[model samples]
Target chain A: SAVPFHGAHQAGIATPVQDRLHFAAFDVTTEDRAAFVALLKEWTAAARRLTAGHAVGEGAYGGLPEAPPDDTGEALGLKPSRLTLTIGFGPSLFTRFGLADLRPEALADLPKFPGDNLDRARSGGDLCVQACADDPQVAVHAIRNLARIGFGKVVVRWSQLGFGKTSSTTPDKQTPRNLLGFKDGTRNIAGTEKDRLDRFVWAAEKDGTPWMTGGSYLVARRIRMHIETWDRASLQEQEDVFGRDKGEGAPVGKAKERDEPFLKAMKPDAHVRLAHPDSNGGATLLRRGYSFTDGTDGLGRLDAGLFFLAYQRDIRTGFVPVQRNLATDALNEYIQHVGSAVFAVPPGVRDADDWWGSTLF
Target chain B: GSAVPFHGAHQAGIATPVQDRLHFAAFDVTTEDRAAFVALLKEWTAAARRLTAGHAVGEGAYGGLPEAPPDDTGEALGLKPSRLTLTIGFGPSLFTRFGLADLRPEALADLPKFPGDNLDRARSGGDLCVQACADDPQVAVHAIRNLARIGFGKVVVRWSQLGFGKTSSTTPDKQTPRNLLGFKDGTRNIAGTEKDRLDRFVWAAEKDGTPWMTGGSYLVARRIRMHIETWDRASLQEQEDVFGRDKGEGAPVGKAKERDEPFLKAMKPDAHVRLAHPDSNGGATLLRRGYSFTDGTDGLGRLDAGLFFLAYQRDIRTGFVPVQRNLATDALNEYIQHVGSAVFAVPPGVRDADDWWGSTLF
Candidate 1:
């Protein structure tokens, strides 16, 4: 009915990526550690029940006629649809709740990159929740009810609603396309790549963040695509910009999608060539990006593009280097980096007794 | 197999068994050339027919011309038509440019300002719009995306909404889906099979003022933003009281089945259902074809999500206005705000191969 929550790693990260995403980032408004910790424990139990196709039981279902229903009744008859609730703590979160000493060396805020038109209102937060599900309503219900539970303690800073998964985490799955209509993340790190996962995505014992030994780092970037301009371009330019066939997503000088990309054969400014891990000092991360079209830009254009979500052991080596390599790529001309955030995704529950941030506590 | 025939007495989407996805777009003309505009309409007609029939655009999606941009964005390459329907409509403003004032219908006039409208002037109106819907969202998105791409210089995307979750039940087998308000909407809606009812309320017949729109209907689109944070704090009973229906069963007040006649007196005078019911609005009724959208947060802790309300009627003056007047004092008004509005004159379906979206004028 639901993806099992008690696992070695967070389900939302690697669990067959869902079709919809409702990502919310909140600021910790309260300084009371006890109440804060209590709320987290409450949130943990609620997340567990939710993933199991049940409701969060603050008021519980019965004996609360006058008060609000424990669960939002909207998802009553609906199945779990493989809902996954992944929680993370932003850098600012560690400053509060006596988490300063517990802060991991690997956790920090993301630095501004070239061509960033970052909207501060859509930017930072102290805490974050990634609610992914096949049914958009299930994901929305989880975030809405969770926000209700965190009414006084947490205030939402920014959130993004993503409908299409532009990246696939499973090797068996077909590569999904982005809003650019290009097959994105054709070279993503699949969950089955155990060696790659340990080295690039998951943090290990010697990673210097003992509390985050089994955890990972999350880097989010909201890239807005210039749809109108991109649409009017010639087919040759479109293929040249992305360094891949428009019809078939095969890389330049490669016969198939799986063929090793010949970096030398691609144009110097080609996106796929410059951003490849091979060209960026072997830097790689597990990409879980999604396509988002958020109405008009208020000026005749669409505010739409990729909501890039990457998981890695360390941002410095995973995303930063790869992004630095792509700062001047041709694709940058068609996209603007609009929003940014970084969070320290904690390890899995291991069992029911363990909570989301159990090691930090 | 999932295709719905493109030709009919009326356009398809108004009663195409509501698809799961929607990519509704409105566009404005940057050029005033009548020939160019008409050519675009004819081109769009050919594209819509092929797309709705599950065929790729141009020379069949592949090997058309390697040097040229593929006519169809190959995303929907393998996906079925999924009952795709591309419904086109002309906005009230379109009459001003092409000496088409004489052809404009009286019912296609701009909607009167309502009680709780916070209409954004930019996203509110358009010269024309196309409603692309399908079970697979990519299929729907592809239709609009390609159309927008094809419409590059001639038209710019004025406003659009990528919506999921079909809110209105167009068929009995389709479950009565709950809106973002957590209430089933249009529970007692006019069924497409009710030919007599369609005759009276939906389809525009001959001698209905505009000859070009004889079999077509007037369209109204309103982007109603639900104040979800406020509604979430309200009690369950308070929520039910606002909607005048059972949250679980979707039945009217004091009624068991959803189709049962509502006991309007048993409900609050300001209840949403009662005020929206035809009995309270002098028999005014319009077919609802709405979908839910969760764009993102308001950057102030609220979700910018709600029902993208779509209504089609034989006459807006007779259908939409009277019912909207009764809902002025409805209890649900406080929890929702209309942020966008538009009125369109939907022409009759293209009857034959040589026909186009607006074949009468051309």
Candidate 2:
């Protein structure tokens, strides 16, 4: 199961109501990205209207938290500028989708295509948009429109994107990627389970979200998968790439499914080089992958795939570092890096009959 | 910028309206042999809830109950053959929740849960308790009280004599269930091909709900609503697009091979317009068990031509959610507004009659 990212509610923000927004990217065409964003805007607008609410983009001036009174009785100072939008595109979007040819400027860093494959660029890019709104209907509508836009062949995927609060100090905790191409995490440092408790912390000492003093973060991700190619690979090949058999998902040297494999011993192999090791700087990321098959194009084939989304406190340590290492990974050849985006999901804000972040900008 | 009360606003928009009213009923089976079957029902309910309500089970509940209620006993609540029937109304809440607000808006809206309207710790406002009865009236009373404690109100309970029909191991010669009128039920319900069956019916995860619920216990919805006489009257081409299947054999249009009813393939450039239409999104696929009903023939030609659409799945998210989302704006929307809805966690199988409720409703 995928956990949601958490965030603390900032007081005195712009919007009247406090809400959360989750978004993700995958290997999709520029046109598809634009279409997805456009659909998102439409879906968001519809959701707002239905709920009698609205959403403002990052940096749009609204309300900001007032400073505490100083000795002189004047507002002390403004809080840190809290609104941010993180976005990135994967190299696979250009490599796999014809977008490389269609948008040469965006593909400057992309591998140059020989003249023989020039026509491969002509393929219209298909995009799948999936969302799990506080309202499921919104998610359905968004996917439906995206499917229509993609000629009914868009690969739609779904998952619960959880989030948690992060302080300015602690190294942003990172979520680990799983063999199935997903980021996973454990939220809220609490409970009797020593292992889970050891990994997470729940206290007011951390600049906690006001509404969620005792509560933890809810992390979420919308990971898009390259299933067309992934499904084509043989089980043995997949195991080799993942260093685990497809049947039981046991590591190479481990027989019992629950036992962790010795990545160090297997490091001699190229694929094992990607495995996490304490001495060799190899670390494992958590993963929970869901499969999705968005209808098919008129070509009589299904545009199905996975939604590769994940969350971590420290994006750099958890996902980025691991992903950077996997760049030359054997799995990389089969899977294309398409869409990428990040958001500083705020934690659940509980206030005086209001949600977290309802006031802060 | 309306200050409408959250519950009030929800009721005004999200509840099922009379015009869009659909009937629903659920049966609770207690038998060990039917454990797998009961598990399947739970999965189906979970999936339907996920598709419509965003949360499987329901809001606040968050996840499926750890286990089903145990069987009834004389020393216990002495509950009789137990089942629940719910009738949902299409209120303003339904539209708001379904992202249909303001005709056409951007992004999308969320759907409302049955108990969303009322915050009263004692009762759920949006849900109207239509029929509540069991062999053990005390058990029914206790259940109703528990529901009220959870903010549910407007509950009405009555007694009735309804028993399971005779068992049949052979194929169901009759199209409709015992209570339902005989119609060509589930013409499009059966798996069109082996691949379809394998992909849709086979259990992938061992711990999946299919094995927990009794093998025979099915989560059935007896939806009594107006049938699409207009749909029945449509030409073959229109029917094919509406139902996303061939009128004659419910196969993918153009492909005679049942197992190869390539819905995805039908979207090819040269395929039939209905099958290939981008908006059609290929064809809506779900094993549907539907039946028709006629409330009465009055001046307005009484409530007639309704269908009871039933389906099964292993996982709610993977199976029903996507399909329901696809069907949200299909041509079928004009004719259907899920009036009645309920999520019942049917019990697993039992060894004897006494053990029926043993594993559930505890």
Candidate 3:
């Protein structure tokens, strides 16, 4: 009845972007394949029920008075709010279980980019669950229950709390602002374009990473923006660096959000110019990023920025080349790359008979 | 809602609409002289009055003291008053020194020990405290920062909390708000205009329980930490099982809408609502003034978030103590831990232009 937690392809990849996000990654604590497999089966069941606004077996009140409750009660009264839970497998998930042969070549850890300031704690994991929903609490609730069920089988490797999404996957959704207060995802690819998605966002049998046939490569970057520095800059300097109007989010040389960006008119080192697919031989990504703030940094400084998420047929053509162009971008002075990760999001589950890792196992 | 009276028989904060943000602090007195302490209180009173009216510290509307509005004032100009209210309090420790012993109310003492308390002394007791509430975080912060700046050498901030997403409201017009637990708390709280309840429970009646404490009451403040990781794994039914109410309706176990009176007997033995019920706690009613807080994630994996619990009463031994004692067996205790605490004897309001905070005592 909802965004079908079970589907042909993952829900969040091209689903209409939600308002909040709680992205977490886990490390496999057990080497036993059966143990890990059982965890996935349980996680898949719990995630399906939560996304549809139902509690896991027995719910909070169904269990005995002395036993632990089922669902974490946080999102109890909340609506489905278009909740979606998408799962992915990292390269490490394969090394322990005799599944290494199935490891997609493109699933390797992303090559360290030039501006990276990666924190190991905020980086990689053996598995990840991206929960997005219109209401923040709902997204948080889903992720929590999944982690609860995986307690013994997995240990939380790292997690990031994000709000105020920075990108929109569907054309109908409004482009949201980044922590920098500038509108982002003005030219992002939409879910409605079937052929363009096949050419860019989805992997195929012939793509060599056939195990990930209906799947996509997911890349995550934790970007910490120098907020005070950005806040103090003149409005014109801010606009010129991003090559867009501050208020209307138009290209520097244009008047509307969707107007054709006057590519030749933008500064050669502008962020908009170098990252556009048109500038990089038609390479595009299905972006789903969000803005985040982690209060203060002990020095009266704001620890705030963007959690950048993207999906594409291949990271080599999508994020790899684009971030390469942004390494020396004009907006570099106002941001730092603090964390990085990449995962092979496999095809979606089918029904009650199927589980998240069914295809790969 | 923009302005609350600064001079009255009682303080504004007790009845003012619960603001969206808070900057509450308890301070330790470093100065021993009576005159110096009194002078600082006078200075603080003047500052508090102007800020609540949405004006600069000394920038009176009639321009009396060459008060030129600061550059920051330009940004705040034309803004709504934001219903700013600053409540000042005198701690129990102040009575032992500063010639306040004769004025100490019997109810003015450090809060007694309660179950599951991991109290930090540094974050606990103080000689003086200030409660600054406002719709904007900046407004709340500015009031406390400026007051602390003025009394820098005489007082040092012992412990302070920056809180938001107001935990409770006494006004009926506002919708019941949710806490980090995702349940709307204190839906049955006493209305601000309910005079008989306020007189019996909140304020010190005119009869000399302590003559100087006629218009004041005892305040118990605590910092509660939520073990989110532990709670997150629990089932939906378990979550509701702890709160003893339908999460969706916030109603009693058998009730429907929020306004319906609770069915205390409908709850299980250890449920939060059952243990904390007034009927169960020797009829001890608490005037809850709590706020939710999230101070980012702990350096470790946990989110450093929870409720900043505040309760005011005519007497703590009967009010906060017995009520808190009853919660000793609550199932919800597994998900929460009380970390910081303090008790203050909030003073009566200024009665005239010349009256100041603690003026009643001297």
DockQ of each: 0.40, 0.01, 0.10
Question: CA lDDT, every prediction?
Answer: 0.82, 0.29, 0.76
Candidate 3 has an lDDT of 0.76
Tens-digit lDDT string for candidate 1 (A1-361) = 4788988888888767888888999888899988888888888888988887776785323334466666666666667988999999998898887778887877755677888899888887898999998787788888877887888899878888786641222133567777666777678888778888888988898888787887899998988988777765667778899788866789877768778788888899898888888888888889997888777767767677889999999988888888888877999888989899999998888887877788888
Worst 10 residues of 2 chain A by lDDT: A68-77
Error of 1 at A181 (Å): 2.3
Q: What is the lDDT for B81 in model 1?
A: 74
Q: Give the CA lDDT, 0 to 100, for residue A23 in model 1.
A: 93
Which scores higher on lDDT, 1 or 3?
Answer: 1
* Native contacts retained, all candidates in order: 0.38, 0.00, 0.13
CA deviation > 4 Å runs, candidate 2: A1-232, A267-289, A297-301, B1-362
Can you write out model 3's per-residue Cα lDDT over A207-241, one digit (the tens) per residue?
A: 89665788989999999987656655555667778
Per-residue lDDT of model 2, residues B1-362, tens digit only? 01111111111111111111112222222223334533433433332222222121233221122232111111111112222212122112222332334421111112333221222212112211212222222222222222222221222211111111111111223322221111122322333244445244422232443333322112223232433334323343443455444433334556763334355545433333333232444333333333233221112211122444443333334444445544434554444445443322223233332332213322
Instruction: Give the best candidate by DockQ.
Output: 1
Against the true structure, what is model 3's DockQ?
0.10
Model 1: pairs clashing at backbone N, Cα or C within 3 Å: none
Residues B1-362, model 3: lDDT tens digits = 35767888888777666876677878888998888988999998888877878776654222232222221222233334567788888888888888667777878766667778898776678887898887755456557656775686788777787674577888866777777776787687767878898888888866847877788877899999998877765666677779788776788888878778878777889999888878898778878888877664465544456899988888888898887888888999999999998888888888888899888787
Which CAPRI category fits model 2?
Answer: incorrect
